[PDB]
Design a protein around this ligand. Structure first.
Ligand SMILES: Nc1nc2c(ncn2[C@@H]2O[C@H](COP(=O)(O)OP(=O)(O)OP(=O)(O)O)[C@@H](O)[C@H]2O)c(=O)[nH]1
Length: 227
């Protein structure tokens, strides 16, 4: 609804997704089939490269406008990829944490309610992204949204979502150890003890998933189009 308000102001939409989880970070629920929509697969720098290419092929086959990029990509390569039409008025949209502010700041640079900023060719872009929250009752979706850091650990109330997330992590990296062992070792290995000198698993989970989202646990993707 807040987002629906924002959509009446624009004709073009950039959906910023995480390349590691292009389905989980889709903007399902909100309708922008009336807009010109670009699927932007962000953070390819911390994603499994062959999985990224397979997502590109997949979205292409469905006749969708899709690009890939990351923080380090020069502004000029991003604009080149996006190739906005002359009359474009653009909304940057996505679920939390996918890199929407980072992209706006790149698009802005040293450039001057919600206000537009203009590219050198007149194209307008809202300076604030629309944040989409979507409905989560599948365990798998929660787990994937946790892995990309779109969903807070605080907001996870079932331990099986932590185990799902870890199963996805382990499988897609190589690990084969048990959940409980991994996180006991992780909590010691990181100095996370509670009263009595007992490993703080809660904190281990929070820190670990934070480091996974941040790409600090290896170049890893969490879903594949074959899945
Ligand atoms: N490795 C990597 N990290 C990125 C990339 N883009 C953004 N980030 C990081 O991801 C985190 C969140 O990015 P933001 O740009 O703040 O994303 P956002 O969508 O505006 O986040 P929300 O405000 O929660 O909706 C930050 O720590 C960024 O540094 C990327 O392309 N590669």
């Amino acid at each position: 609804r807040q987002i629906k308000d924002l959509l009446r102001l624009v004709n073009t939409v950039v959906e910023v997704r995480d390349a590691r989880a292009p389905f989980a970070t889709s903007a399902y629920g909100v309708d922008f089939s009336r807009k010109e929509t670009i699927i932007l697969l962000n953070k390819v720098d911390i994603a499994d490269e062959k999985t990224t290419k397979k997502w590109v092929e997949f979205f292409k086959k469905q006749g969708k406008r899709v690009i890939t990029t990351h923080k380090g990509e020069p502004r000029k390569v991003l604009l080149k990829k996006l190739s906005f039409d002359r009359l474009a008025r653009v909304l940057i949209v996505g679920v939390p944490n996918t890199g929407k502010s980072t992209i706006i700041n790149k698009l802005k640079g040293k450039r001057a309610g919600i206000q537009w900023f203009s590219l050198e060719n007149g194209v307008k872009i809202l300076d604030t992204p629309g944040i989409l929250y979507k409905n989560i009752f599948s365990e798998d979706l929660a787990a994937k949204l946790l892995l990309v850091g779109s969903l807070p650990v605080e907001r996870i109330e079932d331990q099986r979502i932590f185990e799902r997330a870890f199963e996805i992590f382990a499988r897609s990296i190589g690990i084969e150890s048990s959940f409980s062992e991994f996180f006991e070792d992780f909590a010691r290995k990181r100095g996370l003890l509670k009263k009595g000198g007992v490993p703080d698993i809660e904190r281990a989970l929070m820190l670990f998933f934070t480091e996974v989202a941040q790409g600090k646990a290896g170049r890893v993707s969490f879903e594949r189009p074959e899945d």
